[PDB]
Structures are given as structure tokens and as C-alpha cells.
Write a protein that binds this ligand. Sequence first.
Ligand SMILES: CC(C)(COP(=O)(O)OP(=O)(O)OC[C@H]1O[C@@H](n2cnc3c(N)ncnc32)[C@H](O)[C@@H]1OP(=O)(O)O)[C@@H](O)C(=O)NCCC(=O)NCCS
Ligand SMILES: CC(C)(COP(=O)(O)OP(=O)(O)OC[C@H]1O[C@@H](n2cnc3c(N)ncnc32)[C@H](O)[C@@H]1OP(=O)(O)O)[C@@H](O)C(=O)NCCC(=O)NCCS
Ligand SMILES: CCCCCCCC=O
Ligand SMILES: CCCCCCCC=O
Ligand SMILES: CCCCCCCC=O
Ligand SMILES: [Cl-]
Ligand SMILES: [Cl-]
Ligand SMILES: [Cl-]
Ligand SMILES: [Cl-]
Ligand SMILES: [Cl-]
Ligand SMILES: [K+]
Ligand SMILES: [K+]
Ligand SMILES: [K+]
Lengths: 397, 394, 402, 401
Amino acid sequence: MHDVFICDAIRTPIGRFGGALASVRADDLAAVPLKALIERNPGVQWDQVDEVFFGCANQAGEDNRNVARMALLLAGLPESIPGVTLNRLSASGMDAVGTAFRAIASGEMELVIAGGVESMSRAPFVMGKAESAYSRNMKLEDTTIGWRFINPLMKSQYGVDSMPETADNVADDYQVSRADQDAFALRSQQKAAAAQAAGFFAEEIVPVRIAGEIIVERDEHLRPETTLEALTKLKPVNGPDKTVTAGNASGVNDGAAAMILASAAAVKKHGLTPRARVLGMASGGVAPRVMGIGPVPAVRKLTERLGIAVSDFDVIELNEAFASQGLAVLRELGVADDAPQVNPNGGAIALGAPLGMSGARLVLTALHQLEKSGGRKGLATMCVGVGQGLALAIERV
Amino acid sequence: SMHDVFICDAIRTPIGRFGGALASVRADDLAAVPLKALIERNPGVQWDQVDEVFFGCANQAGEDNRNVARMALLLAGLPESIPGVTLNRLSASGMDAVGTAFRAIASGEMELVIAGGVESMSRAPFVMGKAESAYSRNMKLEDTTIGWRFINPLMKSQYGVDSMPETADNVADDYQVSRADQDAFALRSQQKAAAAQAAGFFAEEIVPVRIIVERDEHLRPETTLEALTKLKPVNGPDKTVTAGNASGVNDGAAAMILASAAAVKKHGLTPRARVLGMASGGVAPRVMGIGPVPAVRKLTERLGIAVSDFDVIELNEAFASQGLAVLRELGVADDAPQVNPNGGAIALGAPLGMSGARLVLTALHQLEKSGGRKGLATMCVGVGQGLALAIERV
Amino acid sequence: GSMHDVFICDAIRTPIGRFGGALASVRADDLAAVPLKALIERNPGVQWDQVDEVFFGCANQAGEDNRNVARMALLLAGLPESIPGVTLNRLSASGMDAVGTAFRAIASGEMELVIAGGVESMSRAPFVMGKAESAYSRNMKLEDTTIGWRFINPLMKSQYGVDSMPETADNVADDYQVSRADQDAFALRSQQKAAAAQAAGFFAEEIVPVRIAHKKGEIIVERDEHLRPETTLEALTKLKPVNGPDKTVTAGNASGVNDGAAAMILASAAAVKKHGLTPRARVLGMASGGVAPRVMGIGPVPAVRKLTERLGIAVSDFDVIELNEAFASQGLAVLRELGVADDAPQVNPNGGAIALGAPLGMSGARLVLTALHQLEKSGGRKGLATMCVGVGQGLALAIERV
Amino acid sequence: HQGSMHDVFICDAIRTPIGRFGGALASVRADDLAAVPLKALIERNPGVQWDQVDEVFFGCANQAGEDNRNVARMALLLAGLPESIPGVTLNRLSASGMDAVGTAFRAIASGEMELVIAGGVESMSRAPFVMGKAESAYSRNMKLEDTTIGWRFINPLMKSQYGVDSMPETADNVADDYQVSRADQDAFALRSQQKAAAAQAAGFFAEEIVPVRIAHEIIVERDEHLRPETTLEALTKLKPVNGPDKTVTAGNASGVNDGAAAMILASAAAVKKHGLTPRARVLGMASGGVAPRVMGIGPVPAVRKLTERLGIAVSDFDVIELNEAFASQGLAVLRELGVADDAPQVNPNGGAIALGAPLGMSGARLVLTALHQLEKSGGRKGLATMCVGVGQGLALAIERV
Ligand SMILES: CC(C)(COP(=O)(O)OP(=O)(O)OC[C@H]1O[C@@H](n2cnc3c(N)ncnc32)[C@H](O)[C@@H]1OP(=O)(O)O)[C@@H](O)C(=O)NCCC(=O)NCCS
Ligand SMILES: CC(C)(COP(=O)(O)OP(=O)(O)OC[C@H]1O[C@@H](n2cnc3c(N)ncnc32)[C@H](O)[C@@H]1OP(=O)(O)O)[C@@H](O)C(=O)NCCC(=O)NCCS
Ligand SMILES: CCCCCCCC=O
Ligand SMILES: CCCCCCCC=O
Ligand SMILES: CCCCCCCC=O
Ligand SMILES: [Cl-]
Ligand SMILES: [Cl-]
Ligand SMILES: [Cl-]
Ligand SMILES: [Cl-]
Ligand SMILES: [Cl-]
Ligand SMILES: [K+]
Ligand SMILES: [K+]
Ligand SMILES: [K+]
């Protein structure tokens, strides 16, 4: 088996729903980090790229019909380069990284690109075909996030809880208080505001140019103005006996990210800078109704196989779909609610979460943080709608 | 060291015609059919040990939305502890599921996996972009059954947005594939498929969908050369691709088990073939049908296997023009006996996400019947790709 | 300075098709044109460039009936481009409102020769989708226009409710004490009388056929499709109410959802003479009434009382009453309020909408033409046609055979 | 033996401001918008016994959106009128609101009614999209169509025989066939803007208007479409709608707009009973048809029909309110009727190029504004006339009391 190295990595800013990136087609948005990789890495012979693997949760809109291939062509990569799109909802972009890793480790490829995209602003409506002539039963459904075309058998067996309902279920089952959720959310906002001011995100970001030209360069989901008092006043999404609010949850967002992965031979050939070795990826399943706890079996599976303890990681990038689930996962894994190595630059409550891009962001930001801190091993892990988790481990070199 | 990977049991639904026998069956329910059959057929498996379900699906806007692999495993009655992920390389999605499952086991990250694919083209929805302004007068519905929607002007200007049949006409023109040769190939597909269906070959691959649907519906066994000759080309009288020398739009699902040697033992599986490798290739979108050529060359060069060494070649028949052009470029006769011996998608149809899984499982099936050793499955991909996967009977 | 007498002359209609049935393939504008084409063929003395106006009723106007179907239909029918058209909407009463509006135009001296009619293709009624009220709105929705509420105003719901038409008919059954048994008996008489009229060739005298293309050749639709002549009291008794076990309105004691068109000529005495028409009845007058939306089926009562008080005609003086049968509960309630027996011989002698169906815009025109037809066959003198209207109205129109 | 026709009087009249597409009134449902002038008539006329209103006649060209299912009746209920009052909706496209007035007149004249309300509404901002039903299971042929203005669900037989020219295409056809120059069209457009600006500044429109309340609440008080600073240079620079060889521009055409209007009509006996002020007698209405492809010339046969029957010359009118769908057709109509392009009695306060034209509301506006102008000027007879899509015209004559 072959060592696999993450090399350059870059992302767009993350836009708010209907905000700074809402006019940018998903395929064009995916192409932005690909074009930046080309510009940033002039020693690469681009016709040698073996594959572009991209995560995308939707695929009904301008991201239809294999957005990985659409994006590589729009980015100016040669038509000889193949592309494939992966869908594990919020974990899609991490699955692109781990799939790229397995292709190189198994000797099938040498040089690849992995990343992800989502334009939740531009997610379309969908309408099933008529099932009879002159049918009176036509319906439009929003694909921005969550259930559509509900199967009655899925509802009867597993339920079709909304994402916030699942987060309330985790809060109840794992006993995560509203006060702790809000404290976690505030720390995310404070840490993200500090990282933004320090120029940490700027080092990850390439601008999006929109045709005078408008240039989008800053993550705009952040709410640095957040106070505990303001969080406390919010009403829960699902009623007064519940805990999840708009303030202790991520949002729906737009963005894309990409990075290069390479064998040792490809690193040398293409003049790349190897930044981390990929150690491995593991997935896990849980009940849909408590999907937020999905990371726990994934992390345990990966760490047990690699012979690494959770405490051995110098950074943990844990997706913040909801504070209730971030906290429940940390507690289950034996990590403090405010452990210093967890989400040190904040996370999705502040930054937002374009589903397909989010997992690629967690890997690239974990690597970035290992470089800043001089850490060795990093873990990125996230929950998945309909009850999964994904975990991926890297080691700085 | 890398780990050997074995394909074990494999099963599929029949392939239904658009609006036909399977049109009432939701894509998620359809995907669950072969998964439930793998449970029934493999009594020694401890199902909570399955590491992953990988499924191909080209659409994902309809009842196949939000990661159909995971939806399908839950509907099939598999434990909720089992993860799933959905792959999209258009017509090659199901083959990509197989090769992706292979790489996961080969690299030591998994031991027992299911790979498959689904498409319900009958039930593909319409899509409507959001309004870009309040009171927008510019709202539009687009069909997602097959082909371009939400066309990007930059894609059109640089690469074109040729329909799939237009790309097949382009291949016929550029590679000099005559109408007569296309029709001869189509007739052989129908003849061979009708023979295989009479011999019970497809029946050995099929689990019924419950009215019991048990037979592939797309076959036209009555096809004659005279009948094909009369047909008018899709794109006008100067062109060559017709409805008779092209595949169709179809519904179906397929799945198979892959396992390490240790998992084969533990779960009482029957190892049937070793997976040798997978490769992908890119070509100009406008001649997408030629995509298999760089994929096959890449795979064979890496493995050190000549194309002539394969005892079966399962080449997707999206169009006779591209099937023929691919064979000619690879130095294989238009009617070579090892190519599509039981016919192909012209006769059988091609639900996009399921097709590539069908090619792998039917190649293996054919090796078993014939006593052959190495098999190659390969197919073209819209927007200009190819994928190839090689196996070896145990 | 005096008003002018107004005569109804020739009148014709398509058959009435079932939803999704015999006429479902026919665009609403083309369907409206069918009776217009028949009037042209049937009345060859008319100088067609003299027609002052075509008035057509249509309740929907969102589909192929959009943008003034009266004018679309007259052009499709081959009438001169010089002929104006206008479309009226009083829901189920639209076609009757077309007749009365044509009458008022001639009575007031403003016109001499007109066509009045109505159309509905409920099979082909489209879906509607409001515009986005913001960029990237997540709140887009489709709504069926086949029948009943869409784009509900919360202020309408809060003040008057948005009861479905069958719910209003249950409200009438409750408030006016009309039993399930009586509703089903009325429905059975409608079916029996319509089956008898069909067998007698009565409907055939009113109908122009519609030609339809099939794969192997053409067919003609010549018979009303909605009738259920094998209806029995037992069959009706077994049906479940639309709105739950404590209710009374069923699919069997209500009209349906249907397709059809009708049209007729109205003319001054001078126009009858000039154009070689055959005058058949004089129009006496039209009146409208309003009631609570939640009991819309009782709407005919104020309309009939208003018209008859003004004309000085008792309800009992009419030799035919054509009362729309939207629901048996409301047909019965109206008769009871007006002092007419539930089975009075002069009411709906050839059956009504429970048997025949009710394409909204066409229905009111049908009631007028069939009342006149029945007067001619029976030797009767005065006729009354009246019908209820969604959102709480009634309309009534009286005629007298020449 | 018939009795005597009854004289019919227009009494109070009122309108909303006219909003731009997606502009000041875009948030207001058509049914609620229609109710605004009805509520104002109630407030303005306390002598009326409202349960005596025989009918509310309203024009509306669309009827697919919040104006569905007989907007006249919807609006009268929303306005607080008793549930005993009937309502009916008329559709002659851009002439609907005028057809409501004339239909109300005929109902009173023929003795069938005594006290009625006539008006019209359009919310073109909020006009919905429409989608035909599937004709077959798993149909691949589903389509959305905009109902804001103009053709949808095109019939191939209509297209083949008469064409399906857009309204601006018809206006180009009129420019071509009637020889109306781009320069003349632009000059007409400029005079519309100048006259409307002067009228607005003089408080003339304010006398006709009731404000609309908007959720935020704020009020909308003034017509939004006017471009008072319009120059000929700017008009000259505009590109034609239909391509470089044509003449119709956005600057010499009406717009797409939102608004509602209503007025009271009454017999002499009702005027007395309800303490109304009779303001004009209605003399008559006539309609006419022309080729769809040149629909803008529709007013010519309607005006000729009406004036011939009444025995009034076009030159006898003290005001002519001619709808300005397009300058090309406004000019072509005047020329055919022998009236100068800039005749002082024509549109003295400007027209739809400046003010806009919510289809169902526009014809009611023309009638009420013609009456207003007769009062201001001391004139006697007024003519209101308009063109209609798919080839019609409508004309209505009044006489100040
Ligand atoms: C009342 C209404 C809801 C019924 O709709 P529906 O259920 O689709 O009507 P159907 O004709 O399919 O009848 C329903 C069932 O009752 C049965 N039924 C109806 N009339 C029957 C009869 N006379 N004898 C026996 N069975 C009868 C039908 O056969 C059917 O049974 P099925 O489903 O097994 O075939 C619908 O017709 C409606 O909305 N009508 C009101 C229209 C209106 O408001 N305006 C028109 C009057 S102006
Ligand atoms: C003619 C029509 C197609 C134009 O629609 P539109 O293009 O959306 O109109 P706009 O208001 O945007 O005007 C278009 C442009 O011309 C400019 N323009 C219009 N009038 C102008 C003037 N007087 N001075 C300067 N510029 C002017 C606008 O500012 C605008 O510039 P921009 O769009 O680049 O910013 C449309 O108004 C229409 O269909 N009207 C016909 C109505 C009809 O058939 N019936 C109603 C009357 S009965
Ligand atoms: C129903 C499948 C939608 C995917 C698009 C089809 C075109 C692929 O080549
Ligand atoms: C097809 C008709 C649409 C009009 C709405 C019908 C409801 C009337 O009571
Ligand atoms: C909003 C109005 C819809 C009616 C169509 C307008 C076209 C008339 O010429
Ligand atoms: Cl989701
Ligand atoms: Cl995240
Ligand atoms: Cl295939
Ligand atoms: Cl009826
Ligand atoms: Cl106007
Ligand atoms: K994976
Ligand atoms: K519906
Ligand atoms: K098998």
C-alpha cells in the first residue's frame, strides 16, 4: 500500500442563504477552488490528474449530472480528466477526501483532487411526474434541506424527524441542557470572530469574483455580536419544552472547497508540498431519530483500527450541526465540552455549513490548525442526516 | 500488503421500460429489492458486520434523493448501524460503486460491503429553479428523465450541450461507423438477448419485483434488419442514430457482495471472482461514446493485461455507433464472440445508475457459464468519460 | 324610449363529459367553439357580421379558457373578426349570467343580435403557482384549479370560512333539516328521469356531437356521459358521506366535476325578422341574490323571490322549474323554502346535474335552453331557471314560450 | 308591451394609486386591493343604505391568482358589505373595468336594478404561473407559463389563422400599417408625461385617490409610474422592444401595473333615496372587433358604432379619454377619427404611458377621470375608449349633469 499526502488546499468564503454567493451557480462555485489550485500550483502537470472527487448533497439544481466533471471542465482542466460526485449528505466532502485516499493507497491513482460544493440558496424545487392522466395530485417540494418525497415506510419504521427535531432528541436522550448548548454556541462565535480577525480564515480563502466586478472574500455567516443573554431569549424551534434554537444550530449556506492528494512519487514529480499524511477514514450508522450521535461509532471504529486514542489528537474538528449533538458526541468520547483542541477556530454555528463543502472544509482546516499549533495527529468528524457519522484522521508531515 | 477482494453473490431486478412494468415503484423501494434478496440468498451472513453500502444513482432529485444507498438499506431491513453512500458518474455510477467498494477493502479499511445501483427514469421528477428576485417572471420547469437541464452558458460555448443521441451521431461521423453496421450490431444484440432469455440466463440473475414482474421488458425479439432499416434517424435524414440502434430510458436496480478472504470465511459466502482493478478516462463531451477507450487502455496498461486476454467483454451499448467505434479502436472485431455474448442495452435497456453494476455481475455470470477466466466491463459516460473494471473468476 | 322585447331563438349544447372522460382531450376554447359552429350551420339566414356580441360564462379562466374565452371561441368558430366577445364569471351561474346580460343589452336598445353561452373544461383546469415574494423564496406551492378554494385569503377564512362546496351542502342539510333519506330519494328521481329523457331522445334534440381522433380512426361523442341509470336506493344508502359519518352529502347525492359547452341566439323582434330566425321564448327577466357563504346552496331563494316579486309572477305559475342540482340537500332546501313539493312534477322533469353533471360555466346556459325545450315539448308557457353559487349567491332567470 | 327605459347616473367614484410592477402595491392581494375602493365608497357616502346595493360588477383580466373565483364577490365581502349583496366579474381584458360600468348601466336602464357598484382591479405584480395537467401517466411534457400579460396555452389554430402577436408586436404592426413614425410616437409619449406631471402637481389625481395601507404600517398615496423628467433625447435613445428595425419602445408604451377603482351608478329614484349626488348620465356603450394583429385600432369601430347610434359627432365631446396602450395605436386611432395628434380635449391630464395600466382597473379609471375632467373644465359630453388584446375596442359616452 502507498502513503497518501494532502498538499495544497483552498476554499471559497461561506455565504449566508440568499446572501453574498446566492447569485453564483453551484457548478461555477465548485470551479472556483479548482481554478485556484491551478494558479497556486504551477509545477503540476495538470493532464496527469487521475480523478476529481467532489461531494454534493443535492444534485437536483445547477449541480446536476455529476458536478465534479462539470466543475473540472468549467475550471479549465483538460477534458481528459475524469470526475465523480459523492453523496453522504453533510459528510459528502469528507467522503471525497477519504475516497481519493483509498484510490491512491490501493495503487490505482497517483494524483487527485478532492473537494465539495453546496449552493443551498439555489437548491431547486422538485415535482414528481403525474401517475395518471389529468392527475389532480401535483406538488412542489423545496430541496434546500431535509425531507422531500417522504416514503411512508421510512416514516412508519424510522420516522422523518427534521434535523432540529433529531437534535432535540439527542438533547433529551443524552441530557444536554439548553444552558450548555448556548454556552457552546457562544464559544463558537467568539472563537470564529478571533480567528477571522487573526487572518486565519483569510489563509484558507480564495475570492469569488462576480461579474464593476464584485469580490466576495469574507465568511459572512458569523454573528460576533452574539451574547449569552441574546441566546437565552431565543425560543426553541420545536416548542417550549425543547432546547434547540436558531442560535445554537448551524444554518443553510453556500460554498466550495478543494485540495490535492498525491502519492510520494506524484509529490516529487509535480513539485508539490506534502503537508499531511492521511491515516484513514471510517463510517458508522445510528438511529435516524438521533443522527447527531453518528460520529461516535465512526470515531470509535477508526481509532480502534488505527490503534490511536481520541486523546492522542492535537486537533479535533467536530461538525457543529447543533450544539446538542456536538456536546453529546464529545461527552460520549470522554472529551471536555470546552476542550482546547476541539474547534479552536470555532465551527459551523458561526461559520455555516454548505452540506457538500463542509466535510472538505473540516479536513483542510484541521490540517491548517495542526500547522499553526505544531500538532501531529488531527481528527475531523461529522454527523449525517438519516443516522450516520464519518471520521477521518491525518498526521502533519 | 494490499488485500484481495472477492465478488460473491449478485442479483438484480428485471429492467422495465419507461412508463412500463416498474414505473409505479419508488426508486428507494426499487433499490431495496436486490438488498432484501441478498439477505434471503446468503443465510450465513451476520448482517450487522456489513461495513458499507455503496450505490450508484445518476439523478438523486426524486424519491432517490438524500443518499439513496442509506434509504435503501434501511427499507431493505438491514440494521441501522450499517452506513451507506451514493455515487454519481452518470451511466457508470453502478460500476463506480463496485470499484469504490473494491478500493475500500483492498486498502484494509473494510471487510464486507455491498455495491450496487438504481435508476427509476420513469419517476424522474421535474425541477424548477428558485426565483432570483421578488416577483420574478422567469420561472421554468425542466425534465430530469435524461439529459441536460440548468444548462450553463459557459459549458455550451466551450464544449457544447449535445444530446446523448447527437454525441452518438458525432461518433458515427468522426469514426466512420455506417448506418448498416450500426443496425447489424443492434440486430445481434436483440438476437443474443432473446436467446439468453430463452435459455434462462437472465432468470438466474433476477429477483422478481412484487403483479409479479420477473422478465426484462425492453427486449424486441421480433426485430429484423429490414425493420431497423426503415427507421428514421433521431436527429434528421443526414444522421444515423435511430431508436432501434440505441438503448432506451429504463427502470431497475442491482446489488452484489464484496468481501476480503476473512469475511468470505466468517460469513459463509461463495467467492466467485477476484477484482483486479478499475480505471477512468476523459474525452471530449461531444464524442462521449468513445470514453471507454482511454479507460480500458489505462486499466490494461497498469495491470499488464492485453484486451485480447479477456474471455468476456461487457461493453455498454448506449448506442451501436459508439459500441462499434470503441471495439474498432481497441482492435476487437465488430462481432467478436467474447463481446456482449448475451446481448446488451439495445435489447435490455439501461437504467443509468443500475447499468454498470449489471455489467459487472453479468460478466461474472458469463465467465462461470463459459469457464472463462478474465472479464472486462466498460462503459461510456455523458459529458465525456469512460470507466473500466476487470475481474478474474476464482 | 321604451325597452325592447328579447327573444331566445336557436340553442344547442355539447354532451356533458365526465372528469378525465369523453371530452377530456378537447381544449376549453375549442370546446366553446363547438356550439358556435353548430349555430352557424343551423341558422343560415343570419348575416353573421351583424352579431353585436358573444357573451360567454366561464368560472375558471386560468387554462386554455384564459384571456377572454368568448372572443377566443368566436374566432375559432369561424365568426368574423369584427364580432366582439366578453366573458362573465359568477362561478356556477356564469352561463345564466351570460344569457341575462345579453338580454339586458338588447332590452336597453344597445344591441339587436347576440350569442350567449358558457363553457367549462374541469378535466383540463390547470395548476397555479403564486410568484415568489422574495429572492430565493422557499415558499413556492402549486394549487389545483379544478374546483373550489385556492389562494385562500386569511380574512375570508376568519370572517366567512372557506367551507368546501360539499361542506356547505352538509351545512344546508343540518340547518334546513334535510335528511339523508330524502336527499337519496331526490338523487334517485334525478337518475330515473334523466334515463327516461335520454331514452326518449330528449337530450339528443339539444346536442351537437363532438368528434374525437383515436389511433385507428375518429369517433363521435353524442351522449351525456355522467348518467348512472342503474342507480338504486340500496346503492345510494351504502355510500359513505364525503365529510364523515355524522354528515349526509355523498358522491351519489351530489353533482360531479364535468366538461361541456352550450350557446344560444338572442334577438330583438327586428333582428328575428331580418335574420330569418325562429323566435322560441321571450326573456322576462333575471335577478341575483346573496346569502352566507357557508350555506351557499340556499342562494336561489332570495334570487327567485326578488325576480318573482318584481315581475308579479308566483312561483306556482311556472310550468317548468329548472333548479340546479349541485347537491340534493340544497335542491330540497330551496324547494321547501319556496313552498314547492320535493317531487313536484314541474321541477327538473328530465332530471338534473346529479345525473347529468355540471361543467360550471356551461351549466346555467344549459338550464335556460333545457327549460325552453321542455316548455315546447309539454306545451307549457312560463319557465324559471335558477341555481346556487359558491361563496353564497343565487341567480334566477324567467322566460315565456312564444 | 314594454315600459320606459330608466336614466342612469354615475355618482361618487374613487381609485387606488397605480403601482409599478413589483413596486408600491406589489404586496397587496388582488382581492384585498379591489376591496380598498369599496371601503372608501362606504366611508364617503353615509346616506346610502348599503343592504340595497343590487350588484357589484367588477372587471378583471386574469382571474387565476388571488383574484380567482369571482373577485367581485370576494372583494365586496372583504370590504364589509353585507353578504346579501351579489357580485359578478367581467373579462374583456384591458376593457374589463369599462365593461363593468356599461353592464351596470344596462342593468339599471332595463329596470332590473336601481343601485349598483361598478369597478375593476388588476394585480399584475402578483399574477401567478399556470401549469396544464398531464395528459398521460409519467408525461415528460409539463410546462409553467407566466400570466402577468399576454399569451399562454397557445392554440395552434389561433396561431395559424390570426397569429399570436405580443401586444407590443401588434403596436409595431399598427405603426407600420397606419404609418405612425417613431418621432410622432415619442412626441405623444412626452406630452403624456408632461400633462400627467402637471395634473399630479395640481392635486388632480389626489382628488381621485384613496391611500392603500401597506404592512411594514405605511401608506401609498401617489401614482408611482410617472416619469416627469422624461426627455425626448432619452426617448430617442431607447431600443425598440421587438428589434432594431421597429418603433415601439418601453418609453412610448404603457406598463404593467397594479390598482383598483370603483364607482356608484343609480336610477333617479335611487339617487333620491340614498342621498347621492348625480354627477353624469350614462349615454351608452358600444364594442367593436378588428384583426388581432392590429388590435390597437379596436377603438375606431367601437367609437363609430356608439356615436352613430347616439347621433353625436366625435368633435362634440368636451373630453376624450383614449387609453394609451401604445403611442402608435393612440395616434392611429385619433387620425382615423379625424382628431389632431395633440388635440386639447384628448387625455388633458395624460394617460397610461405616464400613469400605467392595471388591465381590469384601467377602463373604470378612464370613465371616472373623464367625469372628473368634465367637472373641472365645465364640459358637457365625455367619451372614454380603449383597445383590447385579440382585437377589440370598447367606447362609453357620458354627459355631466
Ligand atoms: C361530490 C364529489 C366530491 C364526488 O367526487 P368523486 O368521489 O370523485 O365522484 P365519483 O363519481 O368518483 O364517485 C365516488 C364513488 O361513489 C360512487 N357513486 C357515485 N354515484 C353513484 C351512484 N349513483 N350509484 C352508485 N355508486 C355511485 C362511484 O362509483 C365512486 O365509487 P368508486 O370510487 O368505487 O368508483 C365531486 O363530484 C364534487 O366535487 N362535486 C361537486 C361539484 C360542485 O360543487 N359544483 C357542481 C354543481 S353546480
Ligand atoms: C413594454 C414592456 C414590454 C416594457 O417592460 P419592461 O421592459 O419591464 O419595462 P421597464 O419599466 O423596465 O422599462 C425598460 C427600460 O426602459 C427605460 N425607460 C422606460 N421609459 C423611459 C422613459 N420615459 N425615459 C427613460 N427611460 C425610460 C426604463 O428605465 C428601463 O431601463 P432599464 O430597464 O435598463 O433600467 C411592458 O411594459 C409591457 O408589456 N407593456 C405593455 C402593456 C400592455 O400590453 N397592456 C397595458 C395597457 S392597456
Ligand atoms: C434519470 C437520470 C438523470 C441523469 C441525467 C441523464 C444524462 C446522463 O448522461
Ligand atoms: C374549473 C372551475 C374553477 C372555478 C372554481 C370552482 C368553485 C366554485 O364554486
Ligand atoms: C394580468 C393579466 C392577464 C391577462 C392577459 C393580458 C393580455 C391582454 O392583452
Ligand atoms: Cl438534508
Ligand atoms: Cl462543518
Ligand atoms: Cl448497460
Ligand atoms: Cl345544472
Ligand atoms: Cl388607461
Ligand atoms: K465512501
Ligand atoms: K394538488
Ligand atoms: K445471480
